[PDB]
């Protein structure tokens, strides 16, 4: 702490031990990350193995009930619980661990511990980058999955009637969540989701194209048909020809990178921007502020029975999704709709 | 508008027929045509060709040929520059 005699304390001893170079770096952030992440992952595995969804959703969602890996899920609490935090000591569980499992409190356990585990992992990125004296762009990039998690698993159910409408941790439950957004929000039509899809697909494109470009513009740097042995980590020269890569992509695509630093920042930039845009869109959906319809096209369709677009077809499909999904998907609504009121097509 | 389902019930698709950028599309070929390869000279008139979804098959066939030859062109330029050739192999995935 400067050129001054500060003398050592228990904080200094704890810092020396926590920042010690070991098999797993703990650090000060580990005290938050390791228990929270451990509990989130173990709680999800425990819920998929043993905990049922019979009382919250009226569903079987556990291996012990016969579900497979794609079908088991830690399901959200019942909608009558609203946005209750559902502590095991809370007014609902009141200390009974088995009834806490039955009431959906494991979902809140997993979600909150996962959020704090994400915070701890970001702090771990910061701490390790500071110890190695590197710039914290890894944590800056990891801010985007945290934004997605917050907006999807916290902000959206908090904007809805309760945790019940959050995603349940599980494969087919996420698929339910996705089809629910399609049917009820027209989430494909949302421009923020479109920007997110563009960011994710462009980032996958960038990863593939950059890996291929590097692997195919390599210098020889040694005899042998296995090029992976021609790189030494303690070397001070490039292993692939940036000039040749730029020439190739300029003559193939029209444009090419000429700056390695700009290229790698672009690789950082595209998926983070896409995920942040999608998070903003989900925040919009938390208040049911959807890009559901084009009002001019709806007016044109209402005053002209021969005007059809794929947008109108998708609106019809969304109506079908909502009508055929609601009765079994929202049990708290107690919807018993007779078959005759269900929107259907001819002979299907 | 194109009778996509072959049930004499056309779908507009284009901006001048009331679509925006999001809802605008080149509508696929009529179901009555199926897989039967409908080019312009196989139509009695351009109006019939447009009604039955001919532009879609034209664009799809030319786009398929163009992207296959784009992959080949990627290989060719890699060869002429003295590069390793597998960027075309990487590009085969979006082509697929």
């Amino acid at each position: 702490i400067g050129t001054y005699q500060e003398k050592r304390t228990w904080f200094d001893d704890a810092d020396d031990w926590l920042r010690q170079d070991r098999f797993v770096f703990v650090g000060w952030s580990g005290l938050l990350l390791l228990p929270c992440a451990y509990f989130a992952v173990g709680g999800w595995l425990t819920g998929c193995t043993f905990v049922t969804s019979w009382y919250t959703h009226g569903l079987a969602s556990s291996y012990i009930e016969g579900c497979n890996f794609l079908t088991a899920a830690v399901s959200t609490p019942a909608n009558s619980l609203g946005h209750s935090l559902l502590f095991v000591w809370g007014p609902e569980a009141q200390g009974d661990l088995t009834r806490w499992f039955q009431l959906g409190g494991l979902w809140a356990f997993v979600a909150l511990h996962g959020a704090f585990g994400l915070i701890g992992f970001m702090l771990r990125q910061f701490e390790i980058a500071r110890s190695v004296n590197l710039r914290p762009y890894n944590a800056i990039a990891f801010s985007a999955p945290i934004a997605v998690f917050v907006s999807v698993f916290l902000i959206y159910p908090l904007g809805q009637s309760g945790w019940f409408f959050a995603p349940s941790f599980g494969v087919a439950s996420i698929f339910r969540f996705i089809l629910f957004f399609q049917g009820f929000h027209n989430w494909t039509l949302n421009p923020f989701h479109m920007m997110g899809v563009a960011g994710v697909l462009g980032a996958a494109l960038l990863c593939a194209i950059h890996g291929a470009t590097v692997e195919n513009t390599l210098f020889e740097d040694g005899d042998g048909a296995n090029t992976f042995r021609a790189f030494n980590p303690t070397q001070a020269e490039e292993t692939y020809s940036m000039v040749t890569a730029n020439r190739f992509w300029s003559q193939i695509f029209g444009v090419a990178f000429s700056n390695k630093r700009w290229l790698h920042f672009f690789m950082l930039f595209v998926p983070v921007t896409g995920l942040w845009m999608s998070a903003l869109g989900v925040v919009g959906l938390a208040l049911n502020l959807r890009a559901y319809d084009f009002v001019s096209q709806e007016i044109r369709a209402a005053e002209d029975p021969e005007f059809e677009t794929f947008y109108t077809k998708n609106i019809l499909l969304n109506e079908g999704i909502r009508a055929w999904m609601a009765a079994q998907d929202q049990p708290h609504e107690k919807l018993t709709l007779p078959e005759e009121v269900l929107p259907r097509g001819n002979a299907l | 508008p194109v009778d996509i389902d072959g049930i004499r019930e056309p779908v507009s698709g284009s901006l001048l027929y009331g679509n925006n950028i999001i809802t605008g599309a080149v509508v696929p070929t009529s179901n009555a045509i199926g897989l039967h390869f409908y080019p312009i000279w196989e139509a009695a008139s351009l109006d019939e060709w447009l009604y039955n979804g001919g532009p879609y098959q034209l664009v799809v066939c030319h786009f398929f040929l163009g992207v296959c030859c784009y992959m080949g062109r990627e290989w060719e330029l890699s060869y002429r520059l003295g590069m390793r050739p597998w960027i075309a192999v990487a590009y085969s995935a979006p082509v697929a």
Binding site: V243, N246, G254, V255 | L15, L16, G24
Partner: peptide, 30 residues
Amino acid sequence: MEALVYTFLLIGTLGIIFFSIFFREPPRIA
């Protein structure tokens, strides 16, 4: 009217593409 705006925006984007391809800053070997 709206079709005019959509077509204008699309052709303006294509013009930006054309200029970025054929009038780019040339990368310098120095």
